[PDB]
Scaffold this motif. Structure first.
Motif, short mmCIF file in Angstrom:
data_model
loop_
_atom_site.label_atom_id
_atom_site.label_comp_id
_atom_site.label_asym_id
_atom_site.label_seq_id
_atom_site.Cartn_x
_atom_site.Cartn_y
_atom_site.Cartn_z
N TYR A 101 9.42 11.81 4.59
CA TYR A 101 7.97 11.96 4.60
C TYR A 101 7.35 10.79 3.85
N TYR A 102 6.88 9.79 4.58
CA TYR A 102 6.21 8.67 3.94
C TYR A 102 4.76 9.03 3.64
N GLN A 103 4.16 8.23 2.75
CA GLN A 103 2.77 8.46 2.36
C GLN A 103 2.24 7.18 1.73
N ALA A 104 1.21 6.60 2.34
CA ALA A 104 0.55 5.42 1.81
C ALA A 104 -0.96 5.66 1.83
N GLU A 105 -1.71 4.66 1.38
CA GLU A 105 -3.16 4.70 1.47
C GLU A 105 -3.67 3.33 1.89
N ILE A 106 -4.68 3.33 2.76
CA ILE A 106 -5.28 2.10 3.27
C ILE A 106 -6.79 2.27 3.26
N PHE A 107 -7.50 1.28 2.71
CA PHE A 107 -8.96 1.26 2.69
C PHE A 107 -9.54 2.53 2.09
N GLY A 108 -8.85 3.07 1.08
CA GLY A 108 -9.24 4.30 0.44
C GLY A 108 -8.68 5.55 1.08
N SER A 131 0.80 -1.21 0.00
CA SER A 131 0.00 0.00 0.00
C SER A 131 0.84 1.27 0.00
N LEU A 132 2.16 1.16 0.06
CA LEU A 132 3.01 2.34 0.00
C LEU A 132 2.90 2.99 -1.37
N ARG A 133 2.75 4.31 -1.39
CA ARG A 133 2.60 5.06 -2.63
C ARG A 133 3.75 6.02 -2.88
N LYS A 134 4.08 6.87 -1.91
CA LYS A 134 5.09 7.90 -2.09
C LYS A 134 5.99 7.93 -0.87
N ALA A 135 7.20 8.45 -1.06
CA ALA A 135 8.17 8.58 0.02
C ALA A 135 9.05 9.79 -0.28
N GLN A 179 -6.05 8.05 3.03
CA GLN A 179 -4.64 8.33 2.82
C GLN A 179 -3.95 8.55 4.16
N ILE A 180 -2.81 7.90 4.35
CA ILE A 180 -2.03 7.99 5.58
C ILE A 180 -0.67 8.59 5.25
N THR A 181 -0.30 9.63 6.00
CA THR A 181 0.98 10.29 5.83
C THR A 181 1.63 10.52 7.19
N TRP A 182 2.95 10.48 7.22
CA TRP A 182 3.70 10.73 8.44
C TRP A 182 5.12 11.12 8.07
N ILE A 183 5.95 11.29 9.10
CA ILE A 183 7.35 11.67 8.93
C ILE A 183 8.20 10.80 9.84
N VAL A 184 9.32 10.32 9.32
CA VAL A 184 10.25 9.49 10.08
C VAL A 184 11.45 10.36 10.44
N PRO A 185 11.80 10.49 11.72
CA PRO A 185 13.01 11.23 12.07
C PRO A 185 14.26 10.51 11.60
N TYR A 186 15.31 11.28 11.35
CA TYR A 186 16.61 10.70 11.06
C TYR A 186 17.12 10.00 12.31
N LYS A 187 17.37 8.69 12.20
CA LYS A 187 17.87 7.94 13.35
C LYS A 187 19.26 8.46 13.68
N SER A 247 15.15 3.20 6.51
CA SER A 247 14.19 3.74 5.56
C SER A 247 14.25 3.00 4.22
N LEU A 248 15.45 2.60 3.80
CA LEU A 248 15.60 1.99 2.49
C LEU A 248 15.06 0.56 2.47
#
Lengths: 378, 129, 235, 416
Positions: free
Chosen positions: D187-194, D175-179, D196-204, D285-286
């Motif tokens: 900034y990740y971005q996916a969609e589930i069940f129609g 379901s992953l669409r954009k990153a 859209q889910i977006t969030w941000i991952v900090p640099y470890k 992330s990769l």
RNA sequence: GAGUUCAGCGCCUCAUGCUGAAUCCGGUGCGCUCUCGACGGCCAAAAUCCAACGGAAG
RNA sequence: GGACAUGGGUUAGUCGAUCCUAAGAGAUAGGGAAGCUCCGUAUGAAAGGCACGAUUUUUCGUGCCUAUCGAGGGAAUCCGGUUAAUAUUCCGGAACCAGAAGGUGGAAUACGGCAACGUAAAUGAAGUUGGAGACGUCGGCGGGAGCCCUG
């Protein structure tokens, strides 16, 4: 789109991942996010008569022109100022042939063309003088008009009637027949407004008891009624009945002056609070519309007697010109819209446009500035 | 330049400075009038902890230029004189509200500079009663 | 359908004023908690410890010049559990020689005959073991601190690592961990650059914030891979 | 009837201040915020302030009386007091010296479960999917923070457990669409069940805490979201047939194996591709991004065990590496920069390798989420409420930037 | 447009309407009643409402 | 017949009560009394709430102020018509009061006069002050109204 190397802006641009550091503010920006979820108040919302640019610049007034007026014929313009020298300029040529000096608070020509007598008020004294430029028959007819306020009967200084008032006259008006002269002096309390009858050669105060200062005064152009613009409101008095007619509140701290069309129904009044209110006696006592175009105090407003246009002069140096069509139909409200905004006028001592006069024939505006410069926007 | 206080009218208990005296008499005021500019809204006690916009807002003062009689006024021992406060007071400014408004704006700007410089502290501070 | 979020109703003016007053009251308390008494018992306890420590050194050095030499790990992990007031002169220098100048400091040491001997000398004060790659990873990536120009500097930029360690083929944080776990040629230089970590004992549940002298039950000596679990709790 | 008094109905009745809401619920401020965080509660600014404040003027936060009365019957409020009871009994035990009733009490410490909070706050699964983005940003942020005294270690373990299970889900569901990349993070971005889910991952990274964030608040949010994640992921795995929670192997997890510990007992953009991860790249992330599109992923052993490939296996289609030097460069594993992958993710198109090759200039990155005088002077004065200002605010900042960036293109062409 | 008083009509009828008008100009008080107001003297409380000073907030 | 038999009839936001206190009654705190009960109501009573705060050890800190019954006091409506028996209540017509929200427009980002004072608006927390309510009695005078008188 702020990241490694975006051409959007150049935040910071980074060449690779290695140079890219850890963001220090991330925990802070997320901390404010938390506050959002319970402290941010969630308020919901729904998500053409052309008065062209002035081409004639009349000069000669050594100081600010206190007031300017146009004769009945409209080919001659008489202006006065604190310099004490009265200059008459020909509309067609701009010449200052009548440059006899003879502080004139105001100057107005008689409503009758057959009696070309110009009344110039200096301080508390107003003199009705017949210039020699007019016809001899016109001068002779003017003297017969006259020959509280004491009345007494030089480079062509033909003085006919001189009237002295208890206070310095600020506003002067003449009747349609020319037999009545209205003098308004805001300084006086009991006798602020004086009415002088030329036929009887005397003057009197129409108000038995006067309270409050009066800033302007005028007579109705359709019925024998007198409108006096006080500091806050304007009261219309039926001189025939010597009683009140209607009181219109301008809704301003201090009223400057008032103007009325030839019909006598819709009026435009200027105020010292930079307000231009258009009121109709048949609509309501309150103004039909309001305007605040001037960046400074609205000095005066003038409506053309014939052309369906109005002009407003203010100390800001900008003059607003509006075209207004008034229809006698009950359902046809007056449609007034701005037409032009005159600019490029010098401002001295926070004073710009002082006196504005409309041509008796065309929509030409004669505006006199504080520098003695008169602009004729034809 | 002499500091004066108004004990009559709306501007009661307001300190003013005589920019131009009309005690010789005038047609408008047949008495010992005096056209003076005073302070109606004294600046608030600005705190260094407040922001620059906050400090200026508190330090903002509303001036007032008016003509009052000598009897309505009250002389004081203190006196303050300003270069911009001389020659700017005239009947033309009183006659023209726009000139008066610019006069009020200039007087407030001068008073704000005086308050910023720390001068005329007694005049700047509103008087209690 | 638009819920405008407005400015906070928090009055940040008073908040920092309270914070400044809070800091103003805090520094006064520290400057007030001064010159406490000391009972005659603690003077004994120091002496009993000092002779107990001193006798241990004599038995450790003389007649016991033998070390079991933990094997199958070139790299160890040592942290200091506790120290004794009026430190013995020998231990005082040795701990500094291992950079553990203050308690709760974490330092990597390459395993060899010499290092294990000094560790054996200071054994009753240190808990040492074998960290796993993952445990070393989180240590550098969550508590790694650099010594740039000799100040307390966080390892916040890979550019700083390259700037100060470029000539030893160290460019990134991931270069640091790979070098440390592999103990390469530049291991000494990297360990010189690394500032010691601070694994102060964590106090979360109510029982810990109240029990006296709580240090998570940290013993002293060899702990094998339990140091990995201790790090996992600690990091 | 009597003359009805002022402020007995309307905006002076529904709107109730914070201090009144404290004494009505009988709570202290810190508990009141906690139940406001857990429930959905937020101030609401009244339209008429001094009307709503009994004629007062001072700035005060307001709440709906209907809202406060809901908090009166909340069953969890009792579990706040039961913990106030518990704390005093555990202090009593330590005071007397009962080091055993202290140990048993702590075992039986009172608990509260947010099951009914989640149901009453998000009724439908689609409601959860809409309002879960901050939860993803929250939990992912915490998994790379050193455990402090304010935030317990087990809570961090809950973040890492719940974070990985979500990453496993998206890869399993494709379901992953954009990153997107930025200095904020990935900034990740996916969609589930129609939805859209977006969030941000900090640099470890070995970050620092600014010592001004009030961790008490941040602790309750974790105690809220970490409840949400379990039940949201539970439905997703049941929908996908996976057994929630997926089993985790401790031995693998202590080797920095990432998702490898857990077993799940243009989606095909990188289906026919094999990638290897060198030891200088953000493996965390990769690993997630490539396997989301079918990429066969191996990594350097120093980043963690469980690598299906080794270094010497030439089956790798692209040996990603941002190191400026590659001594033992292979063949058939064309060496490109990580920005190539995310650019391919955004466009859903196999990008050009050589422009992203080692030592090549980095292409810019794109964010995938991203008479006249008279007609303009009459409505400025002849109308009342003045919505004419909309142009002066909405259009101004768009016109200026549009004028600015259009001049960037002309000025940058001049540079070339 | 109401009411009051005159003149007329409507008609098997509970048809009880219909049509005209006027319903005006004054004055007086040691009168009587009450009310308000300017003087001269003789010597409740509570409920409730308004305003001011004041300058916290922007 | 006021007798009995058989039915019908009292309509209110604006009229009164319900709202308040006075003298006193008077429960309580207390205390007497073998006891029904008695005294006591300011009494050696822990006797009522306000505001502030990124949340404070995710266990409340900081700051301020000190009963009750009892009838003269009290916001707001008049006209005309209408019944077997009803009107400030019903009818027809016309207003007023209180309270309530949002909406529109107006101004708003207060004013002039030496003055008493005036306007369409024209920030005001805690705290402080005042007025009205809310005030003895008599005599004469002025103003008005109505009745009566009169052209």
């Amino acid at each position: 789109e702020e990241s490694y190397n975006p051409p959007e802006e150049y935040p910071k641009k980074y060449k690779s991942l290695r140079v890219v550091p850890a963001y220090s503010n991330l925990i802070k920006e997320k901390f404010e996010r938390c506050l959002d979820l319970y402290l941010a108040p969630r308020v919901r919302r729904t998500k053409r008569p052309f008065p062209t640019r002035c081409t004639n610049v009349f000069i000669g007034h050594k100081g600010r022109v206190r007031c300017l007026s146009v004769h009945v014929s409209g080919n001659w313009l008489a202006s006065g100022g604190d310099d004490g020298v009265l200059r008459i300029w020909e509309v067609m040529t701009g010449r200052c042939v009548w440059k006899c000096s003879l502080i004139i608070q105001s100057l107005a020509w008689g409503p009758l063309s057959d009696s070309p007598v110009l009344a110039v008020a200096v301080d508390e004294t107003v003199y009705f003088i017949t210039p020699p430029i007019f016809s001899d028959e016109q001068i002779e007819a003017s003297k017969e008009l006259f020959t509280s306020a004491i009345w007494r009967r030089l480079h062509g200084g033909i003085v006919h009637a001189t009237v002295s008032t208890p206070s310095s006259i600020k506003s002067l008006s003449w009747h349609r027949r020319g037999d009545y002269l209205a003098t308004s002096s805001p300084t006086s309390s009991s006798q602020a407004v004086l009415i002088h009858q030329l036929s009887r050669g005397a003057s009197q105060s129409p108000f038995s008891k006067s309270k409050g200062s009066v800033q302007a005064v005028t007579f109705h152009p359709t019925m024998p009624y007198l409108l006096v613009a006080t500091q806050r409101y304007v009261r219309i008095y039926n001189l025939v009945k010597q009683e009140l007619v209607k009181t219109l509140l301008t809704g301003v701290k201090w009223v400057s002056s008032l103007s009325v069309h030839s019909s006598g129904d819709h009026v435009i009044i200027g105020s010292y609070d930079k307000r231009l209110c258009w009121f109709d006696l048949d609509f309501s006592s309150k103004p039909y519309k309001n305007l605040r175009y001037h960046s400074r105090a609205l000095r005066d407003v003038s409506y053309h007697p014939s052309l369906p246009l109005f002009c407003s002069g203010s100390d800001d140096g900008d003059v607003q010109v509006f075209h207004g069509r008034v229809y006698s139909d009950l359902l046809a409200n007056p449609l007034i819209v701005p037409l032009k905004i005159l600019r490029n006028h010098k401002v001295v001592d926070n004073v710009g446009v002082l006196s504005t006069c409309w041509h008796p024939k065309e929509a030409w505006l004669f505006s006199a500035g504080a520098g003695g410069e008169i602009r004729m926007w034809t | 330049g002499k500091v004066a206080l108004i004990t009559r009218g709306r501007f009661a208990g307001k300190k003013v400075v005589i920019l131009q005296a009309i005690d010789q008499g005038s047609k408008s005021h047949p008495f010992g009038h005096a056209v003076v500019a005073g302070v109606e809204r004294y600046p608030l006690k600005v705190t260094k902890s407040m922001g620059a916009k906050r400090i200026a807002r508190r330090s903002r003062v509303k001036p007032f230029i008016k003509v009052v009689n000598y009897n309505h006024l009250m002389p004081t021992r203190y006196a303050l004189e300003l270069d911009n406060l001389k020659g700017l007071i005239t009947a033309d400014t009183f006659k023209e509200p726009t000139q008066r408004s610019a006069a009020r704006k200039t007087v407030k700007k001068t008073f704000e500079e005086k308050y910023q410089s720390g001068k005329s502290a007694w005049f700047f501070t509103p008087l209690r009663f | 359908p638009e819920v405008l979020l407005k400015k906070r109703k928090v009055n940040e003016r008073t908040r920092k004023e309270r914070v400044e007053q809070a800091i103003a009251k805090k520094e006064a308390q520290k400057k007030n908690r001064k010159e406490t008494f000391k009972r005659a018992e603690t003077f004994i306890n120091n002496y009993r410890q000092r002779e107990r420590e001193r006798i241990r050194l004599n038995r450790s050095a003389k007649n016991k010049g033998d070390i079991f030499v933990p094997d199958e790990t070139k790299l160890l992990f040592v942290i200091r559990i506790a120290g004794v007031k009026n430190m013995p002169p020998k231990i005082r220098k040795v701990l500094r020689l291992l950079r553990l100048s203050r308690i709760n400091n974490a330092v990597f040491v390459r395993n060899n005959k010499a290092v294990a001997q000094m560790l054996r000398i200071v054994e009753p004060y240190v808990m040492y073991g074998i960290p796993n790659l993952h445990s070393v990873r989180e240590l550098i990536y969550k508590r790694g601190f650099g010594k740039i120009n000799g100040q307390r500097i966080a390892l916040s930029d890979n550019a700083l690592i390259e700037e100060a360690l470029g000539k030893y083929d160290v460019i990134s944080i991931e270069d640091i961990i790979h070098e440390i776990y592999n103990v390469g040629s530049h291991f000494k230089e990297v360990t010189k650059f690394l500032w010691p970590f601070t694994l102060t004992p964590v106090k979360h549940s109510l029982m810990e914030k109240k029990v006296k002298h709580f240090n998570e039950g940290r013993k002293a000596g060899y702990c094998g891979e339990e140091i990995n679990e201790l790090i996992k709790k600690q990091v | 009837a009597r003359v009805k008094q002022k402020g007995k109905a309307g905006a002076a009745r529904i709107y109730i201040t914070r201090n009144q809401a404290l004494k009505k619920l009988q709570l202290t401020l810190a508990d009141f915020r906690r139940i406001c965080i857990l429930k959905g509660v937020y101030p609401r600014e009244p339209k008429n302030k001094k009307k709503a404040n009994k004629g007062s003027t001072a700035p005060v936060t307001f709440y709906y009386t209907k809202d406060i009365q809901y908090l009166l019957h909340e069953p969890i409020v009792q579990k706040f007091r039961e913990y106030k009871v518990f704390a005093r009994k555990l202090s009593k035990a330590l005071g007397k010296g009962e080091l055993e009733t202290a140990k048993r009490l702590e075992a039986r410490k009172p608990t509260y479960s947010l099951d009914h909070i989640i149901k009453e706050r998000y009724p439908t699964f689609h409601d959860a999917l809409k309002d879960i983005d901050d939860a993803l940003s929250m939990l992912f942020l915490f998994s790379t923070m050193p455990v402090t005294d304010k935030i317990g270690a087990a809570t961090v373990a809950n973040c890492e457990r719940l974070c990985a299970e979500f990453q496993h889900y998206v890869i399993r569901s494709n379901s992953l669409r954009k990153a997107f990349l930025s200095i904020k993070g990935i900034y990740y971005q996916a969609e589930i069940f129609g939805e859209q889910i977006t969030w941000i991952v900090p640099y470890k990274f070995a970050q620092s805490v600014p010592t001004d964030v009030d961790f008490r608040i941040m602790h309750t949010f974790l105690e809220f979201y970490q409840a949400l994640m379990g039940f949201v992921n539970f439905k997703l795995y049941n929908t996908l047939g996976l057994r929630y929670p997926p089993k985790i192997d401790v031995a693998k997890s202590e080797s920095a194996a990432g998702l490898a510990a857990y077993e799940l007992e243009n989606t095909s953009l990188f289906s026919n591709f094999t990638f290897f991860l060198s030891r200088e790249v953000p493996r965390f992330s990769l690993e997630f991004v490539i396997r989301a599109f079918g990429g066969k992923v191996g990594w350097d052993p120093i980043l963690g065990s469980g690598s299906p490939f080794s270094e010497s296996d030439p089956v790798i289609t692209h040996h990603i590496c941002d190191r400026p030097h590659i001594s033992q460069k292979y063949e058939g594993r064309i060496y490109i920069q990580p920005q190539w992958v995310y650019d391919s993710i955004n466009k859903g198109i196999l990008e050009r390798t050589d422009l992203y090759a080692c030592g090549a200039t980095l292409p810019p990155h794109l964010s995938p989420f991203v008479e006249e005088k008279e007609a303009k002077e009459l409505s400025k004065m002849m109308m009342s409420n003045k919505q004419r200002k909309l142009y002066s605010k909405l259009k101004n900042e768009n016109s200026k930037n549009e004028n600015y960036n259009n001049a960037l293109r002309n000025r940058k062409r001049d540079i070339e």
